[PDB]
């Protein structure tokens, strides 16, 4: 019942914390990979085309992918890449934290 | 009137990607008012103490910047939440 | 609010005059078709293309 | 795939198993007895209305 | 009373009230039906 769900949730969150790798010891590439850039652009374009608040100033453009590229140029994309290690461990890099090319 | 703490799994809209608390409230919690629920066991008379869980476990719970997991094929985000419901 | 400049024009164009809109998916998933429709009706739809959602359950969506 | 209808659940994994005679007798809609399909669907036949709607006949399930 | 759901053929009974909606190919559903014809079951472990 409620307590069974409580212990299930506790086990799930404990496993999640045991899998997360803290910011002070991640050993992945500092750069943003091409796949990461493409998916971050696609997801940000989806979000803005779904009537999300925007930060950069529109120059009359109406292509959501172009607006997402403008945001990536201005480093205004509020997204996090969760790079998954083979065993399930994950490092949460930020878009601004990564260096594009 | 019994206070029943529950854990939700709700969707977050890109329109509400800037005030996720009010987004979750208006998407899910506000409809539940004055409507009987097949899970809790009574008509919900209100809510309070809505706290959104974090997709990053190492983040301190006192922080104000939490992570929501975006659907791979949709700009919507799904996250776990905790909230107390006033149930009659 | 940044796309109605061209999408309204395409709806006015209709399915036949490139570039145009064959269908206008409503908020509730309804897929209206502009193929068997007149120019004035297409203009009216394009004028009502960007409207506030009257239903609360579908206030987090926009027409396609 | 409409992007305005998000799906919350997800299939984590699938495990192969054996369908036992008890559960299929429990889950089934009706048993099929006579080897006649049509006369209109044959009641108790392969095209019975308990196995789904069929040519403007509303499903009986 | 509340958790009693009926059938078109009159077989009313209480049972599974915990179902979700996932996104799958329909050929998966056809393959599931075909495997059920073979007596084989596939359990789909929904995540949440």
């Amino acid at each position: 019942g409620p307590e069974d769900f409580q212990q299930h949730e506790q086990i799930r969150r404990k496993t999640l914390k045991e899998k997360a790798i803290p910011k002070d010891q991640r050993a992945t590439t500092p750069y943003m990979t091409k796949y990461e850039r493409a998916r971050i652009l696609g997801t940000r374009a989806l979000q803005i085309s779904m009537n999300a608040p925007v930060f950069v100033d529109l120059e009359g453009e109406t292509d959501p992918l172009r607006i997402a590229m403008k945001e990536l140029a201005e480093k205004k994309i509020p997204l996090v890449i969760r790079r998954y290690l083979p065993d399930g461990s994950f490092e949460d890099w930020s878009v601004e934290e990564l260096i594009v090319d | 009137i019994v206070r029943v703490p529950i854990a939700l799994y709700v969707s977050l809209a890109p329109m509400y990607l800037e005030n996720p608390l009010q987004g979750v409230m208006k998407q899910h919690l506000n409809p539940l008012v004055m409507k009987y629920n097949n899970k809790v066991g009574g008509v919900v008379l209100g809510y309070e103490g809505l706290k959104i869980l974090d997709a990053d476990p190492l983040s301190k719970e006192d922080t104000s910047e939490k992570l929501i997991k975006i659907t791979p094929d949709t700009p919507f985000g799904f996250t776990w939440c905790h909230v107390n419901l006033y149930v009659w | 609010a940044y796309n109605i400049a061209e999408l309204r024009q395409a709806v006015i164009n209709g399915p036949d005059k490139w570039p145009g809109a064959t269908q206008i998916q409503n908020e509730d998933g309804s897929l209206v078709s502009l193929i068997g429709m007149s120019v004035e009706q297409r203009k009216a739809l394009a004028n009502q293309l960007l409207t506030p959602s009257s239903n609360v359950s579908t206030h987090t969506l926009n027409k396609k | 795939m409409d992007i305005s209808k998000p799906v919350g659940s997800e299939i984590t994994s699938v495990d192969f198993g054996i369908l036992t005679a008890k559960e299929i007798r429990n889950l089934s809609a009706k048993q099929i007895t006579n080897p006649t399909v049509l006369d209109h669907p044959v009641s108790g036949g392969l095209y019975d209305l308990a196995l789904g709607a069929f040519l403007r006949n509303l499903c009986s399930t | 009373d509340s958790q009693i759901w009926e059938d078109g053929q009159g077989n009313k009974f209480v049972g599974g009230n915990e179902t979700t909606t996932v996104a799958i190919p329909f050929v998966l559903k056809y393959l599931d039906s075909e495997l059920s014809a073979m007596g084989i079951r596939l359990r789909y472990n929904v995540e949440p």
Binding site: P2, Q6 | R3, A7, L8, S11 | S57 | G8 | -
Partner: peptide, 18 residues
């Protein structure tokens, strides 16, 4: 209705009604 936009995917009781 009942899309994944008005109703939660899962409602789970954290603890007994208190």
């Amino acid at each position: 209705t009942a899309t994944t936009l008005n109703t939660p995917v899962v409602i789970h009781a954290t603890q007994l009604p208190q």
